[PDB]
Chains A and B, each alone.
Chain A
Amino acid sequence: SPIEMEEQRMTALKEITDIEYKFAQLRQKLYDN
């Protein structure tokens, strides 16, 4: 179904995007330390 696939792919994008967010602040705090 197109609705199922749409919500799935956007969920995965939000997933890896918040991964990017927290790994970026990982870089930030490691830089600080």
Chain B
Amino acid sequence: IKLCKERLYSSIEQKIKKLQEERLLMDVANVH
């Protein structure tokens, strides 16, 4: 159960990092 929970959480934190790079590109987009 430890491995399974933290594996799915690794996926959801790659989701949060998806949004990190999202706001990276919108960071340069506000620098525009």
Contacts and interface: CB of A to CB of B under 8 A. Distances in A.
B29 to A, nearest CB: 8
Interface residues of B, number: 4
A13 interface: no
Interface in B1-32: 23, 26, 29-30
Contacts, number: 4
Interface of B is mostly: helix
Contacts of B30: 24
B5 to A, nearest CB: 26
The interface residues of chain A, by DSSP majority, are classed as helix
Report the interface size class on chain A: under 10
Interface of A: 24, 27, 31
